[PDB]
Design a protein around this ligand. Structure first.
Ligand SMILES: [Fe+2]
Length: 186
């Protein structure tokens, strides 16, 4: 039974239930994430920005099966084109807007990676990606408004690949946490 999360803490409790088993009901998790109405006071602790790039701020370590984190995107900050390491990845906007550009997996041949589509993710929307859907780049294209997003990955992963848009060639990247549970982790 899926109920509206009343608060971020409540959402987290609900996620622990949704991931209590071995499989993941993506549409249910997405619906639950979308249903949480972003309340800045509840996540201010995790919203630690860096002037130069987006930050990843661990919120909950999950139950072995998932991780929940907050990403903070300064004006003009964006990601590489990347995959998600065989994990489910949910992205819910808590503040601002993000542009998501989708790309197909490249062929072995070196070639320009051309976008298959793009969309604007708006406050409170929850998007979902996995490797079967494709690769993506996520960017805050705003000149004036920072963005904050809530990301859920299952299983947890701490590496992915970044892709060279000009060639499709990939390089492994180890992902780091800017903070964990509200504590800066240099
Ligand atoms: Fe991503």
């Amino acid at each position: 039974e899926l109920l509206k999360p009343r608060t971020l803490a409540d959402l987290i409790r609900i996620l622990h239930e949704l991931f209590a088993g071995d499989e993941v009901n993506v549409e249910e998790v997405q619906a639950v994430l979308e249903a949480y109405e972003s309340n800045p006071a509840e996540w201010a602790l995790y919203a630690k920005f860096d002037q130069y790039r987006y930050t990843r701020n661990l919120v909950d370590q999950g139950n072995g099966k998932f991780n929940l984190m907050i990403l903070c995107w300064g004006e003009g900050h964006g990601s590489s084109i990347h995959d998600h390491t065989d994990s489910h990845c949910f992205l819910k906007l808590l503040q601002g807007n993000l542009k998501e550009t989708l790309f197909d997996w490249p062929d072995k041949k070196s070639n320009e990676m051309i976008k298959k589509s793009e969309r604007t993710l708006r406050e409170n929307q929850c998007a979902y990606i996995n490797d079967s859907i494709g690769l993506h780049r996520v960017e805050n294209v705003s000149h004036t408004e920072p963005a904050v997003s809530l990301h859920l990955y299952s299983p947890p992963f701490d590496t992915c690949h970044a892709f060279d848009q000009r060639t499709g060639h990939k390089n492994k990247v180890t992902m780091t946490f800017h903070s964990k549970f509200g504590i800066r982790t240099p």
